[PDB]
Design a binder for this molecule. Sequence first.
Ligand SMILES: O=P(O)(O)OC[C@H]1O[C@](O)(COP(=O)(O)O)[C@@H](O)[C@@H]1O
Ligand SMILES: O=P(O)(O)OC[C@H]1O[C@](O)(COP(=O)(O)O)[C@@H](O)[C@@H]1O
Ligand SMILES: O=P(O)(O)OC[C@H]1O[C@](O)(COP(=O)(O)O)[C@@H](O)[C@@H]1O
Ligand SMILES: O=P(O)(O)OC[C@H]1O[C@](O)(COP(=O)(O)O)[C@@H](O)[C@@H]1O
Lengths: 460, 445, 451, 460
Amino acid sequence: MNKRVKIVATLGPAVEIRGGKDVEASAKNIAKLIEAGANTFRFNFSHGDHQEQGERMATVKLAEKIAGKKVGFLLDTKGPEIYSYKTGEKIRVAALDIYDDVEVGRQVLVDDGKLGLRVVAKDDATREFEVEVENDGIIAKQKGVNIPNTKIPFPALAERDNDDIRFGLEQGINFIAISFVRTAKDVNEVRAICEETGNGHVQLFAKIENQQGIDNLDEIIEAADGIMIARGDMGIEVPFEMVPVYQKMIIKKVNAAGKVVITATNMLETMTEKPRATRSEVSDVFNAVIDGTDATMLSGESANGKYPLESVTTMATIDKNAQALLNEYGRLDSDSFERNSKTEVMASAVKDATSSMDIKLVVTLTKTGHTARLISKYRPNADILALTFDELTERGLMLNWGVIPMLTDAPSSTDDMFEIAERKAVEAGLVESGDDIVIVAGVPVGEAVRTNTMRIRTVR
Amino acid sequence: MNKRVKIVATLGPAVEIRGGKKFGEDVEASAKNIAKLIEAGANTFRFNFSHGDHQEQGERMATVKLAEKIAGKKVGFLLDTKGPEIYKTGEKIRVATDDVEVGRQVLVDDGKLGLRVVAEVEVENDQKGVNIPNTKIPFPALAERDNDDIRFGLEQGINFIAISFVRTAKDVNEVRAICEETGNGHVQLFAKIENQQGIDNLDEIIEAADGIMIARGDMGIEVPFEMVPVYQKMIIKKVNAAGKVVITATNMLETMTEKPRATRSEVSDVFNAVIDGTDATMLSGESANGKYPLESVTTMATIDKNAQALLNEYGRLDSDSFERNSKTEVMASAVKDATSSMDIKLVVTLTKTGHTARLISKYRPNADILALTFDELTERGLMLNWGVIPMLTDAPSSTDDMFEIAERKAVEAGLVESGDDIVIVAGVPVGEAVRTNTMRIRTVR
Amino acid sequence: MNKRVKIVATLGPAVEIRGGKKFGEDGYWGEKLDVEASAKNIAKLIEAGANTFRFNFSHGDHQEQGERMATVKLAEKIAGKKVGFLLDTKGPEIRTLNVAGALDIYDDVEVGRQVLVDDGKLGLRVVFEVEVENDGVNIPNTKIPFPALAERDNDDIRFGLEQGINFIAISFVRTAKDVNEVRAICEETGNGHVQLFAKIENQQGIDNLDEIIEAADGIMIARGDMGIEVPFEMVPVYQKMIIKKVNAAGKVVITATNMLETMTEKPRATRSEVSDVFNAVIDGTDATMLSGESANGKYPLESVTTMATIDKNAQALLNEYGRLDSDSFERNSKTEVMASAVKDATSSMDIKLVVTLTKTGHTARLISKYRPNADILALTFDELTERGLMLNWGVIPMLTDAPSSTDDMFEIAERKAVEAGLVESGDDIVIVAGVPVGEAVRTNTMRIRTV
Amino acid sequence: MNKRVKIVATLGPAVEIKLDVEASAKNIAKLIEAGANTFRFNFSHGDHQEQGERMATVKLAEKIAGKKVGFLLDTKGPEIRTKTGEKIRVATKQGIALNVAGALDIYDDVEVGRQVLVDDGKLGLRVVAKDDATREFEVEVENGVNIPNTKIPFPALAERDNDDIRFGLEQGINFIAISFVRTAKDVNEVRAICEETGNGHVQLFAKIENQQGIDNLDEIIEAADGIMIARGDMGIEVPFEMVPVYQKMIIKKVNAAGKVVITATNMLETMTEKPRATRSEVSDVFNAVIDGTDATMLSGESANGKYPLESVTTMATIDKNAQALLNEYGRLDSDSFERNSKTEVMASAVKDATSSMDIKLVVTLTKTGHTARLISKYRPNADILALTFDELTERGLMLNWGVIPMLTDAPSSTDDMFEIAERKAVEAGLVESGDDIVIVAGVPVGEAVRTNTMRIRTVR
Ligand SMILES: O=P(O)(O)OC[C@H]1O[C@](O)(COP(=O)(O)O)[C@@H](O)[C@@H]1O
Ligand SMILES: O=P(O)(O)OC[C@H]1O[C@](O)(COP(=O)(O)O)[C@@H](O)[C@@H]1O
Ligand SMILES: O=P(O)(O)OC[C@H]1O[C@](O)(COP(=O)(O)O)[C@@H](O)[C@@H]1O
Ligand SMILES: O=P(O)(O)OC[C@H]1O[C@](O)(COP(=O)(O)O)[C@@H](O)[C@@H]1O
């Protein structure tokens, strides 16, 4: 019984066992988050340096060979960043001069948006904001400041970020989560690097963190390969009771576009410290599966928590069960999609087959992962083994709902792709004799040009 | 545009030209006539054995075999068995023989004169056929008058038998005993429902039979005349659910027996038979013995063709409720999906027995269904399934590309042209595949 | 079991006794109309379920029409039930050519048009030099400038309003203008209460269907001529699309022509005629019509009774097979939302009767738009609005005293229902009214009450 | 814009100022202004005396806030109070060991292969052998005491339970949540106390904490007046990954029954020691409102947190956003209910009017509060003003979805309840001139059994 929601697990020091408190030891430890249900590790280049990142990547390539399973490599960029008080205390506040881009009536928030300073006056002397306090609270050395609803001219791509992804593209990554995507352009420029440097295979998840990115969700979905729902920044930058509705609506739109969405931040946050999750958190990751998410993500829980292995297995088991109730309660609705291509109508016909019968497995023989993404779109009640013929495409499919990618030789004009499909499934022990599978391919290899053939086969 | 609903035309004198003189005033003359019913959209000729001798039926079936040669199209051959058979308000009268309750009605001449038995009968309103509604009278499940006729038919070469006055599975099974004992298992059996006992046992009759003939004449006398609309909707639904074929019969373009144009109730009634889900519509008297036989076929074909353009909006069958009971079904379902997802011009099934062509027809895709079959008897046996166009082809070799043969037979048929998308289903590889197991979406070159 | 689908029975010589002799007995014409004998012939059609009589002003002079309407006013008193009076206009016409208003059609019949003869059985193709194509006169797809209202129709409608009619059925409606011109006669002469049914009978009438329904009080599908003027195999699609639309408009539809035609000669209808009446009801029609079958046929009483039982049986299956859908309606007024809530109530429990205290019949029309699964008793306060309700689906009109501001209309409602013989005790009814009387502007209260 | 989803706030030291009261009265007072609808006194963290004066404190809180609220008492209910491989032992013996509630021999009920979870389902002791002769247990360590999936005959009515139920009924309460309900009888011998005392008007909420209570859900719902989903204990008694399944299915069965349902546990949990909620917490609160819950519960977040007023104002914000997405995402579907009574069917028409037109308010003239409970079940798109004529059913409606309980003098047989209906709502500040409202009542008053008539009126 396989887990179909993918897990994106952030890495950090928690798994890195430093001289007993060291590669092959902590590679044998992250190879355990792989066996536990992690499909992609996140490297947040906001909390490390290239020397620390470049190392923690060669050590995961070690764990893949320990565990036998491969995983995806995702770089998260850093992107635009910016004494206890009591109410009414009118004060003020001081590399871009954001002076004329924040206006009166805005709100300046410090630390997880925990202290509000409404800007009441435009002091123009020392270029300062005459603000005042709305609630008692702190300002600590170096904590996040968000000025919501403002459109501060941050670069489409900050070169701090430019250098970061360029280093990732040369170690060997598969995805880039772009932080603070406000327009399609913030995506296009990271795209222009992936093609310039010869890495068209990389997939871009835009992170939606503020109102600029929600009011542009369409044109961003169009330009990106996925959406990461960075709820943290979004839950400061827009009303905190609107991220449940914005999350339901993002998962639906992104599924409609045939792309991947990842639901992020705070999913098992207690389990950073304590060894068990609140039932508010088991509710959350469960509901993300019913809203249609491709993948659930661990941030702090996996990177710098006491229980890194525990929060993967936890998510894994919640995800595993919540998949069992998508028939009854599922919110995605494939029956409303326009089938906009021959491969997509085929993907529909496969969903129909799994609804009509007990299909154990769908197999697709796919060069670029297109029919695998499209089958995944329709969320069949069966797992999708995607036989592809190049590791980059294989790794590129590891966040798609239900997809199990697997390398095999590109087939010649003279070999039953249908026996190959049965053979590779059984080798993987995903089907036992008498199981029914749905195999799709473009046949005959040579004249096919797209997936064009659906076959129902019972395993010998 | 191809007529999906099939027409069963009852044969008789109205087209048979005897010594140059028409009916009511020579097989080559009558063959050029029958050739015109065929191009007009007759898919199957009916031979009602209830009115005719064995000399007559033999000679007509002669005439249509020539008609196919003239017409360049084949049709099916249907034998209608005859089977079981038999004053003013207040006159008191008796009649002479255990199955008739004192309370039953007797009706002489086509259910118009009413004898309500009281011990002895009494008239109720102001060698004839008699009905006794709501009685389980033990007519032989297999009569002998019929037993001889059926054997006489299978002799000549027939594809269907319509069993008059079915009321239990026994009445069909014993006619199916005769077909697989003469080595014509290939013959398909329509169970005419005509009375309450038929309707009460309709499920077991559907199961035994290959299809129902909704026999509305007798059925109008035997059940209350205002429930046959209700029965017609519920029989078409159930037969369809059982992957079988339902003919809707008698009185359809009635006044076209005498006048050149149909009443607006008649047009409405053919029209609604399609919307309810009929596989076929039937002309009885209208084409057997009537002044405008070809105009009756042409009118029904024109009506049938329109009503199918509205099956999506108005249509009553609903394939989403069906349970796919075999791997061939879930692929029939998956074909219907394909035709819903994009503009598909034709379904092509390569089919040894026509099983696959029937499950596809069952699902009623929005596309015609070209059936590529390898013997004349499977071919003719598919001519009453909704939307199936039977086309004889050479059995594909172990090297032939059957998706190519599907395209070439369809372009030969003139059912497709360069640009059209088609769905093609097959058993691959040929011979070793136990059932249709492959679906292809092919663009026509 | 009250028949909720109303019937329109055309009257004619078939029910009329002329000196002991029935219609067709040798020497029946130029005799003495036995009016009291003819009145209890007619009176039995009324009991058998005829809800309104059609006087077809194409096959009668003004005196014979005037006399028959008299006989029907008697028949009511025998039957102890009242019916509506319907005038069917002659309309624009051409016959073998004689044209109405002696018009010259020559400058607007283009070439490539058809010319049909006798019930559309023989075709003539304009090349008028015209060729025969196969072995009354219609000219499909033309816009012959027939006056929006001729004069013979003007005089027919006026004679009829004088006698006292409740409905007019306007022949060959091509646009709203044909309707608004008869609506002006009706208002000009005091008869603003009269209701107009447009007969859609041709391509321009169908092309203009929306604006016509907007002008009229409802539609008479006259499938006869419609099937000569448009491709015969469309009449079903048009029947279904007109019923759905006239219902979305909360107006009345009548399905008509050849419905039980075999019964005009032989005494039992064919299977396709029983089919046709059944499907009309399942389609959504308020009303089924008889023409020849009841006017000059050998079994007018039987054809009425047959239509009634098909209609009574068909209605019991509207819940399954029924084509109309009151769920997609937009409720455009507070009375409609009350109509909606009545219909919801008759769906949650068994309701044997809905009652409405209606001054104008509005609430009655809006309730019957929603096709609740009960009967509708309309208690109205004059014979004009009572009779005017008589072709609305499921509506039983009954005249009662206008309630006073010191009256329980809910007890009035129960008392009248028990008087009519529709309820017994323990039955559940929905009652609807504007309370308090003389202060409520509109039907604003519903109540569920045990008899 | 009023709030329809009710809040149950648990009171504790956190709002109270020796214990003063007039100072504690004006903390509790703005909890009511925030949205707190019913106060919960968990009678397992305090004696009869202290919890007595807190109920005295809130009723003057009521009269400074200018709104009345409800009184819920949670029984202590049944209880058992007391690294890998360690083969320890634990004893069934009493007064030696387990502090079984009211003392019991729990031996011949806990079979081998069960599981003894000490310290909040923290530690796991897999029972491996039974010492039939001694009667103790032989366990083996795996990774308060809960023993899942066993029918321990816990005191169906302990006198410790019997004691505090009677002190509440004397002090003026409204609801009793009954802990660890496992059969119908656990509500009967507490309802038999209420009818006894002359307090049949009080309503009982079965707290479902264990598996027996989930196997017996139907007959308990039949016997109780509501369910409190105690996701605290439930997460330990059943597999933690199914409490979101069981929560969704509980709320459905409870709302089909026409009874109240409360989502409790861990809901705004971080809002105890931190000032803003996790994004998994807000999604949790949000989802239970889409699930169709009548009320949402704060425990320690208002009983002993740093931010009790803020926990209620935030929960009040999430409830009023989720309520506005009920016509789109709502899991409850009233179109499937059978309409059993003539009051159900009148409630069904009120629903109809709120979907046929803009209905600002539905008003019920009710005495039992029945009609207001049938209307609430069908969840009309509008608030419910329930007029009833005594503070002893006025209080009991305060946990029903959407209903604003308001008291006035019972009407005379010579009046139009409708006029007084329009008159309360205008005084109540819920409607202005032109508002369309739906009034339901039984007429004529003094000779009419059930709720009888429905009227549509536009506010004078
Ligand atoms: O059916 P569509 O959307 O036109 O996709 C067809 C395209 O996808 C491809 O078939 C790639 O498909 P796979 O990567 O799934 O094998 C291309 O050859 C082809 O051009
Ligand atoms: O898939 P099902 O319904 O079990 O039926 C399969 C059977 O019908 C057949 O497929 C025949 O099908 P066709 O005649 O339509 O090719 C047999 O080969 C097989 O025994
Ligand atoms: O609710 P609506 O459609 O605006 O109807 C309002 C009209 O209905 C009427 O009550 C007519 O109603 P009744 O004839 O049914 O009594 C008028 O007085 C009123 O102006
Ligand atoms: O639910 P039912 O069967 O209509 O019964 C209605 C019940 O509610 C009551 O009408 C109470 O109604 P209220 O809501 O006005 O208090 C009782 O008279 C009656 O027993």
